[PDB]
Design a protein around this ligand. Structure first.
Ligand code: SAM
Ligand code: SAM
Lengths: 161, 376, 269, 54, 54, 53
């Protein structure tokens, strides 16, 4: 569960979870047959003994296309007891008034759209970043190659390609 | 009996040490076995050296040719065996660093050589160290993979930490493809998406970057830097290090090494250099201007295709390109070299000084292949 | 008779923290006449093939099962550029450890074949010979499997053997390609060794396990560390405590049993 | 020796008893007496002795 | 007898020479002394099999 | 270590257990005298090169 209000900043939001503290609960945001845990700074837990305000997530447009499947971590096996996706974090009402992060979902040439004008594709070969879009110091994405951007005015409905 | 071969590199190493160290005899005293002999052979290696060895020897020859006599150096990540001790001359301090503890002697050296393990890709250790030229070959990609960061980020950290240093010339083994990516089968297959290598002969892999990004980082570091991409030697001048120390070459291996060098070049950087403006394309068949100011009306320049001269500018009619001209512009104090090229590649532009002294180098520049745009 | 029995315990972040001083160690009366008699009798009566082959197969099978927490797949994979510290004498077959050929050809059925295997040790035949307790000129390896024992250089002294264990841990961690793993055997587990490992090796390792392929009555144990050269907070746990307790107590029971049987070539009356 | 495998006899040497006055220094009998004393006390040869002598 | 107690531990034999890696200590001596000693111990005057450059 | 030819230094060992004697009885005499296939009163020694008795 998460509070009624959420912010898109460096501090991000935080959710609360009810689960036995015996587990470890890494992210494992899958994209294919592979799982690609790939969330060092996107999710972060304090202390599993208490509610610990799990999942200090830093939201961005890519989540709209990304299902997470919170999994369990053991020594021999991973995600064997509990493994379910963040179903309602799959889709969030993104406030177009406030800026947000512009990580990319996949390498397959995703095109950015502000309000239907079909802004230049994000993963287009030989890409030039717009002057307005700022790159974050630490890209918050499953792939280390993908950088992070900021998009204050609108910039929703990232079109596939 | 103990069998081994000697070499001029061995002699150069032996010329450094003042007192010969003494091994510990434990590993030989423990032997309570019988090891039958064999007839000695000069070139024992019957399968010839491997392409990895050939590439390492290219790097070593480049280092040895770059270093002069009586110069303070410092290598980044030499290894347990200080191979650089056999490369550079025996009259120069050679203080080198590596994260893993060394295996060489301590003391008993004529010129001072110091070892130290401090993870050179970190902050707060260069302010005390001294040096003029710095070498980092076959270690930067390893460190980038170890810290699990991108090659550009690791390079930027290295350059920002070297800014504290007092060196003036810098040559490292950067990791960038300078040609169409080919994915050499069995030795190096490049990953377009994730930008990794996955050396199948060692199970290793590390990221890479591109020339414009590396040059932008170097320019942001120093404005007056003179970046230059050393070209691979088709003349086999590096073969001296192999033949003069009893190693067979196995021509297929040397061809593979030549193919593999183009993806792992080594850029030379002069912190105190001469900047020079340029145009956008520099593609063959079209005009190409170049601005280089302030060499007081003595402009003996000579850009090199690979190692041969082209446009020595003592007489433009003797150049090897389709056309080239020059002007002084006394009011501005800068030459406007405009010419048209016919072969794509990287040029040196050595820029022989306007004096009897040796030539002071300028940056390098790459020319692009012809366009495929036509209209009737 | 038969193959070896495997007994293992791997780190889990959920059990407990326990100080090294709370762990059991080697018994005092371990180097006595009757104790050596029992161990030698059991070793002579044991009917097996190559002890090293059996141990190495079991350890590799139990070692390619671990998976790191920082990613999903696992620690060890195919083509890892392994190094084998402590290569040995002839084994009546090839002149090297009998695991190299099947483990390169992909015959163990639980291990992917590595890229190459270089050998080291006093008694090697196809590799360099060096003193592994000190630095030496070599490359870097993503997985170093040390089988060197603390008897040849330990001059019949438990303290010297413990110091040698410390030095060999130090060497094996310097030569292990940050991001990889290693395997070291400990002949004589003592509280000094436990304290040194807790103080120096655990904070620089991601995960670990320690196994014991039972083939002959003794107190040797293997130590497997995963993901070296990475900061982390690790400590011994109640699982390791229970493992060591069962280990030492089964040693004691088998020793008390074997010290009551007759000699190997006795004449009964 | 193995500490758990009995032998039919703890020492095999002879220890010449009387006639030593007839054999002094640098004689094969004297040197063999010294070697047998050493072997009884428990020394070992640095060279491996085969299982079937020649 | 100041020597310890343990059975002979013999290594194995091999029909070809094995590589060796030296390791160094603190003590030092004169380079000319080392050269004179290697000249005493050498066996250089012999014709080795040449091999093959390329 | 060495006296005149080098002996193993650095270590020293010897047997520890000795079997008890067995008296020789008429049944044993007869069993040794009718030499069976498993236990004859002799044992062949053979050359180390030609491998013959
Ligand atoms: C296999 S070696 C090759 C060195 C080569 N002979 C040379 O100096 O050109 C690679 C070395 O780079 C070093 N290098 C890689 N990452 C290390 C960083 N994190 N700390 C300092 N050493 C760095 C390692 O210590 C390693 O010994
Ligand atoms: C009991 S054995 C292990 C044999 C191994 N299982 C095998 O079959 O390959 C221990 C070996 O390690 C070697 N050794 C012991 N101490 C060593 C040291 N400090 N450095 C290098 N080798 C050592 C010995 O020569 C011995 O052959």
């Amino acid at each position: 569960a998460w509070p009624a209000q959420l912010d898109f900043t460096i501090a991000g939001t935080d959710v609360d979870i009810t689960v036995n503290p015996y587990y470890r609960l890494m992210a494992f945001v899958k994209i294919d047959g592979q799982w690609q845990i790939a969330n060092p700074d996107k999710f972060q837990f304090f202390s599993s003994n208490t509610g610990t305000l799990v999942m200090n997530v830093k939201l961005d447009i890519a989540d709209r296309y990304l299902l997470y499947y919170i999994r369990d971590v053991q020594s021999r096996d991973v995600g064997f007891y509990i493994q379910h996706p963040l179903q309602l974090l799959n889709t969030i009402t993104l406030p177009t008034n406030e800026d947000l992060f512009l990580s990319a979902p996949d390498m397959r040439e995703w095109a950015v759209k502000e309000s239907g004008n079909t802004i230049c594709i994000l993963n287009s070969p030989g890409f030039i970043p717009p002057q307005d879009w700022d790159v974050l110091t630490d890209t918050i994405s499953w792939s280390p190659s993908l950088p992070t951007y900021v998009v204050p005015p609108g910039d929703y409905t990232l079109t596939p390609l | 009996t103990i069998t081994s071969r000697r070499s001029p590199a061995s002699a150069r190493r032996k010329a450094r040490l003042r007192y010969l160290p003494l091994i510990d005899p434990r590993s030989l005293e423990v032997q309570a076995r019988t090891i039958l002999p064999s007839n000695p052979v000069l070139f024992d290696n019957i399968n010839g050296a491997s392409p990895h060895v050939c590439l390492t020897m290219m790097y070593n020859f480049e280092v040895s040719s770059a270093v002069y006599d009586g110069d303070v150096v410092l290598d980044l990540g030499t290894g347990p065996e200080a191979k650089i001790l056999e490369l550079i001359p025996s009259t120069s301090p050679v203080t080198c660093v590596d994260i893993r503890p060394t295996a060489q002697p301590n003391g008993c050296w004529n010129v001072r050589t110091t070892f130290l393990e401090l993870d050179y890709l970190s902050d707060g250790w260069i302010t005390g160290v001294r040096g003029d030229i710095v070498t980092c070959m076959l270690s930067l990609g390893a460190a980038a993979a170890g810290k699990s960061m991108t090659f550009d980020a690791a390079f930027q950290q290295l350059v920002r930490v070297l800014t504290r240093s007092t060196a003036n010339v810098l040559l490292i083994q950067v990791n960038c493809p300078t040609d169409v990516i080919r994915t050499i089968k069995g030795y190096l297959e490049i990953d377009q998406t994730n930008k990794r290598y996955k050396f199948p002969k060692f199970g290793r892999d590390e990221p890479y970057s591109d020339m414009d990004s590396l040059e932008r980082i170097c320019r942001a570091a120093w404005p007056n830097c003179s970046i230059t991409w050393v070209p691979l030697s088709y003349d086999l001048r590096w073969t001296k290090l192999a033949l003069l120390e009893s190693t067979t070459l196995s021509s297929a291996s040397v061809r593979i090494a030549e193919l593999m060098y183009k993806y792992m070049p080594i850029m030379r950087i002069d912190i105190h250099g001469l900047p020079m403006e340029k145009q956008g394309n520099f593609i063959v068949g079209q005009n190409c201007s170049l601005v280089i100011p302030g060499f007081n009306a003595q402009d003996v320049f000579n850009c090199y295709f690979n190692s041969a001269l082209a446009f020595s500018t003592e007489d433009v009619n003797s150049a090897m390109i389709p056309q080239v001209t020059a002007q002084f512009d006394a009011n501005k104090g800068e030459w406007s070299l405009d010419m048209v090229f016919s072969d794509a590649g990287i040029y040196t532009m050595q820029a022989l000084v306007g004096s009897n002294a040796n030539p002071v180098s300028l940056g390098s520049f790459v020319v692009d292949s012809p366009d495929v745009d036509i209209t009737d | 008779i038969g193959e070896a029995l495997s007994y293992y315990v791997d780190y889990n972040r959920s059990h407990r923290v326990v100080l090294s001083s709370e762990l059991p160690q080697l018994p005092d009366t371990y180097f006595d006449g009757d104790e050596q008699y029992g161990r030698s009798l059991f070793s002579l009566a044991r009917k097996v093939g190559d002890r090293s082959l059996v141990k190495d197969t079991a350890v590799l099978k139990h070692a390619y099962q671990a998976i790191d927490p920082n990613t999903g797949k696992e620690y060890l994979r195919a083509g890892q550029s392994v190094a084998y510290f402590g290569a040995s004498a002839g084994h009546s077959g090839a002149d090297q450890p009998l695991v190299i050929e099947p483990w390169m050809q992909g015959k163990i059925s639980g291990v992917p074949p590595p890229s190459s295997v270089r050998q080291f040790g006093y008694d090697v035949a196809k590799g360099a010979i060096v003193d592994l307790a000190r630095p030496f000129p070599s490359g870097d390896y993503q997985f170093v499997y040390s089988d060197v024992d603390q008897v040849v250089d330990g001059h019949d002294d438990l303290s010297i053997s413990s110091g040698l264990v410390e030095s060999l841990l130090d060497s094996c961690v310097h030569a292990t390609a940050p991001g990889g793993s290693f395997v070291m055997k400990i002949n004589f587990p003592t509280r000094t060794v436990w304290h040194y490992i807790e103080q120096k090796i655990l904070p620089n390792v991601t995960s670990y396990m320690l196994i014991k392929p039972f083939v002959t009555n003794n107190v040797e144990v293997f130590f497997v560390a995963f993901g070296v050269h990475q900061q982390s907070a690790l400590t011994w746990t109640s699982g390791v405590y229970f493992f060591l307790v069962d280990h030492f107590y089964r040693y004691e029971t088998l020793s008390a049993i074997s010290r009551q049987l007759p000699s190997f070539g006795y004449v009964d009356d | 020796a193995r500490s758990a495998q009995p032998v039919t006899r703890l020492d095999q040497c002879y220890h010449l008893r009387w006639g030593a006055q007839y054999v002094g220094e640098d004689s094969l009998t004297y040197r063999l007496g010294v070697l047998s004393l050493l072997a009884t006390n428990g020394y070992q040869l640095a060279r491996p002795i085969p299982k079937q002598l020649t | 007898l100041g020597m310890r107690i343990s059975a002979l531990q013999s290594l194995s034999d091999t029909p070809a020479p094995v590589q060796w890696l030296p390791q160094y200590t603190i003590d030092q001596v004169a380079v000319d002394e080392g050269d004179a000693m290697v000249s005493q111990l050498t066996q250089l005057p012999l014709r080795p099999d040449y091999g093959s450059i390329w | 270590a060495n006296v005149w030819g080098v002996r193993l230094a650095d270590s020293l060992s010897s047997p520890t257990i000795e079997t008890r004697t067995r008296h020789y009885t008429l049944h044993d005499f007869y069993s040794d005298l009718d030499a069976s296939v498993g236990k004859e009163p002799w044992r062949p020694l053979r050359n180390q090169r030609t491998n013959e008795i």
